[PDB]
Amino acid sequence: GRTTIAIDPVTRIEGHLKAEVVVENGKVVDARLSGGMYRGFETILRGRDPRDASQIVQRICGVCPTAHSTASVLALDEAFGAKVPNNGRITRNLIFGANYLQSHILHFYHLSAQDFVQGPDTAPFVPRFPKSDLRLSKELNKAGVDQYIEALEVRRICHEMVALFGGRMPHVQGQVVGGATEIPTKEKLVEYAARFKKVRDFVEQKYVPVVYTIGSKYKDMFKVGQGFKAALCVGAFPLDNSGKKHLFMPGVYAKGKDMPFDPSKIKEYVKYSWFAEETTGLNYKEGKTIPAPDKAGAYSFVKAPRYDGLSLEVGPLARMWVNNPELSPVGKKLLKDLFGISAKKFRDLGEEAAFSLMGRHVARAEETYYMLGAIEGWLKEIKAGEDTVVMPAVPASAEGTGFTEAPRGSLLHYVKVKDSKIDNYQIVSASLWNCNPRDDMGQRGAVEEALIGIPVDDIQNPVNVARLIRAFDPXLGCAVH
Amino acid sequence: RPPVFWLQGQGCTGCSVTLLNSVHPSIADVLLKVISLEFHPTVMAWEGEHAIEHMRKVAEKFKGKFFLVIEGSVPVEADGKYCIIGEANHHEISMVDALKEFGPNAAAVLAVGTCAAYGGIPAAEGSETGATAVSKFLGDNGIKTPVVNIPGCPPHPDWIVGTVVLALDAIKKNGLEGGLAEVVKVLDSDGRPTPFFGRNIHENCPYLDKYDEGVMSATFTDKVGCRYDLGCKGPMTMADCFERKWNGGVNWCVQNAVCIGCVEPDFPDGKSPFYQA
Ligand code: SF4
Ligand code: SF4
Ligand code: SF4
Ligand code: FCO
Ligand SMILES: [Cl-]
Ligand SMILES: [Fe+2]
Ligand code: NI
Known part of the structure; x- marks a missing residue:
């Protein structure tokens, strides 16, 4: 009865992923995710001037490098005892916030949209599965195509926004220990705001409405992909200089309950990962990275992070669920008009629909709208001309941890400094939380679990396997590093 | 209209992203009329062994005529296992094996980004994967296919598009073989086009x-x-x-x-x- 389907490479994600599922009676009944490429940034970093980390770590991933930059400089700030000036904190938020817009827009249109929208008869939009379950009307499919094309311009403008104070993108030069390297001028602030206005218009008028509208043709996709229904947020985008208030506040949600985040409860397991057996179960402060590509039973270069034993997911759904902000005006209206749902705040979607294949796309669109308001605020808060950096000395001995939220989910970097050089550097990244293999006790990773129950009514056209995976916006470069 | 296969080794996808940032007036034309992007894991429609098999069927039809773009380095340690790029009917395909298969049959290879060109960060001190530059890997394995390096971490999109434009003009004026010979003339000792x-x-x-x-x-x-x-x-x-x-x-x-x-x-x-x- 059972059929095993292997998909390598899973495409329209970042990086190298193999998915293997077992299908029985038209549904996925088991799953394994394999991250098949390793670079080993945690060992490459050793012995370097710690200030180099904020450049080296960005090369983990050219889609989300500002996230790694941010985590790294936050770790360095702590280890160096550097107090980032108020204006530099805001400048960092403007650099990084612009890439949230870029990344979510890239994800929905250029990675995910072909899951629902039929492209024209030209590579790379053909060939594809003969029965791809593409349900949109002539008009709606055309809207998807036109918006994919427009989004190419919009995501590029987002990178212009990042580069204004960031230097260039991918791989910014503009964030360093102690703040930001370039004070915003009045002139460049006008340039940033002009671009921001165009991005806002696209997000409000095209992107958010299209996700709900496509979602309304795929209501069945809100009923699958729940997985553990457990979420993590470690906080991001500091709104003051005392490390208190953040745009996204930290918290954990599991078994229907909200609880504080305590990073000491993070452990990384490796039984099913290609790393030396003796390195299993380490918290990141004690982390070790010893590759073992021939180890029997292992199936991924992604370690298996667990929070107090729990397998959690991260990303826009996780943050929006944990923080529970008010929904966008257009979202509220489409929920009413298309879904018959009266909703005010994000959790009004209900746990079941929020933690679903389509729910995660909706969360990402809502979060993009939410970020618009934050950037609007920072553009009013920033003061042209005010210094954005301090120049701290390299300490001989120190440690630091930087916590932030990458567009795909929770990210932390830990650095230990000895003899003025990097002694250890450990990275616990977003897609690591989502796309990891089983832990030592046999508990599946978040996406592995969310695959359970996914419908596969046609083994010759098993499109929902990768649709589920793409809803999580996986980045296997980040997950493995 | 020659096919292009874009293979990612130990890359970060930043070389793909930088290309997405191009405002070059020729970019859309290059993708829609001049060449055909038949395989690219980040953006293509199909997936898995079907995507691999599509690339293979195209490669066979266009033997000696397709172009490879490589993003990221090629790791040779542990029998290539530090980078698996696909699986065909249960058979894993490492980056090592992909370049050994497709490399000999390409008209030319563009090593895009410092990783592919020179080894870059994955090959840096402290690394353990045998991260290898494209030209070095191909040469070590007796594959003589022309390689052009377009480095940077990431490269500017103008360097990638502009190199394609240089090739386009040269190949139009002298044919495939003669054209590539003309491109070789304007490469520095590190395989980089001197205009950029x-x-x-x-x-x-x-x-x-x-x-x-x-x-x-x-x-x-x-x-x-x-x-x-x-x-x-x-x-x-x-x-x-x-x-x-x-x-x-x-x-x-x-x-x-x-x-x-x-x-x-x-x-x-x-x-x-x-x-x-
Ligand atoms: S003049 Fe100074 S700033 Fe300019 S390239 Fe030379 S060292 Fe760098
Ligand atoms: S200025 Fe230097 S670091 Fe920046 S893109 Fe050019 S070569 Fe690279
Ligand atoms: S050259 Fe740099 S930007 Fe390109 S794949 Fe390598 S690390 Fe990424
Ligand atoms: N966003 C992003 Fe990249 C991932 N996953 C990081 O951190
Ligand atoms: Cl980012
Ligand atoms: Fe790690
Ligand atoms: Ni990433």
């Missing part, structure tokens, strides 16, 4: 007068002085960023902070520490 990598950053820097005067910035946010003391590697770097700048001309590394020498064969180790001379 033929000039030194420092020699053309707007802050050179300050360098000469010995006026050095002591904080990044001081934009008046030379960035040399802050670690600028412009003196040892061959790229035209001073001119075209970055992301629609809105900034570049030297104005914003420092140059880290990202296009150079010794990046990153030979350009590190980044924040002192």
